[PDB]
């Protein structure tokens, strides 16, 4: 049951509860329940009483996260919805679904709520984009309230301005790699003021075939909580995948932790060294490699 009825008034004295004028036998006159019971009691021949949809709710949680893979054939997400006090009227041709992309506020595709059979909305995910928030609404269009004589006040909300429900689909990458997070280089020696990317110091051992490919694809890096020993010596950039070696030189412990698989605590013993820390020991035949940031490969001489 509701409190909004599309009726057909058939007296011609003067319609009360409305604006100035509007006296004749009027149809499509959307009234309240407090309104309608004060006209049936007032000796009016108000007929064709049809209830109107005040329930446009969605049976779904709002802010969902949808991890989307690369190869996506079909994979329809089913959204349950229900519009209760109606089955098929002229107003249900006005109820619209819409997939608003919240990045730039444009719809992807729209559906009419009376043609979606079985009360289940099967949204395709072949058209959804990655790392962009979406919106699924039950808005009435702004040109729906024009064809009806709604009996409201100035500051009250009419029916078409009232019923709506919106959920929020977050479509991001799946990620969640398979690996033990193996290292890629022992004896990490870096210069004094330089930057070292993570894709040349650590990789991951794939469990299907034992490959030692590094972390090149970046949607895996947010699960890697990199932790340095001292804050003043080095610092991990989060927007990039680099460490920031400041003026202080010495030993640091860089603890790379992956949260999904248990026991991915990776420890790097990184030695920060100056310019002339190299030349006083290149003569006494201490052969080891120091990372060269201009080309990425580790060099010794």
């Amino acid at each position: 049951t509701t409190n909004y009825f599309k009726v057909k008034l058939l007296d011609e004295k003067l319609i009360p509860f409305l604006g100035l004028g509007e006296r004749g036998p009027r149809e499509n006159v959307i009234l309240s329940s407090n309104d309608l019971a004060s006209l049936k009691q007032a000796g009016w021949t108000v007929t064709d009483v049809q209830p109107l949809p005040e329930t446009g709710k969605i049976k779904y949680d709002r802010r969902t996260v949808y991890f989307k893979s690369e190869g996506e054939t079909g994979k329809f997400i089913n959204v349950p919805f229900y519009i209760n006090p109606v089955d098929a009227r002229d107003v249900l041709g006005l109820l619209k679904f819409d997939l608003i992309k919240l990045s730039d506020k444009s719809v992807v595709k729209t559906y009419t709520a009376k043609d979606i059979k079985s009360e289940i909305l099967s949204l395709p995910t072949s058209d959804l984009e990655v790392n962009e928030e979406y919106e699924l609404k039950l808005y009435f269009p702004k040109d729906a309230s024009e064809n009806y004589d709604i009996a409201i006040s100035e500051g009250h909300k009419n029916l078409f301005e009232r019923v709506k429900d919106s959920v929020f689909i977050k479509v991001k990458e799946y990620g969640k790699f398979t690996g033990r997070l193996v290292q890629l280089q022992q004896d990490i020696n870096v210069l004094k003021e330089s930057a070292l990317p993570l894709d040349k110091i650590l990789g991951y051992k794939d469990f299907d075939t034992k490959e030692v490919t590094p972390v090149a694809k970046e949607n895996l890096l947010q699960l890697l909580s990199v932790n340095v020993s001292d804050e003043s010596y080095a610092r991990y950039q989060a927007d990039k995948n680099r460490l920031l070696f400041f003026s202080k030189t010495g030993e640091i412990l860089v603890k790379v932790i992956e949260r999904s698989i248990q026991d991915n605590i990776v420890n790097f013993n990184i030695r920060i060294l100056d310019e002339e820390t190299i030349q006083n020991e290149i003569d006494k035949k201490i052969e080891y490699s120091v990372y060269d940031p201009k080309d990425g490969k580790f060099e010794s001489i």
Binding site: L14, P16, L18, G19, L20
Partner: protein, 49 residues
């Protein structure tokens, strides 16, 4: 809208930037609502738009 005073008409053509001596009791039917040259316009007059 059953009781209460009579509403005057809203829009006024002010083409040219000004209009002089424009009567506000146009569109109101004579006799019942207004008797021309007899009743006055009330002091709750304001423009809203």
């Amino acid at each position: 809208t059953l009781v209460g005073l009579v509403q005057i008409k809203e829009d006024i053509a002010v083409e040219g930037g000004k209009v002089t001596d424009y009567d506000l009791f146009t569109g109101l039917k004579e006799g019942k609502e207004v008797r021309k040259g007899i009743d006055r316009l009330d002091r709750k007059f304001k423009i809203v738009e």
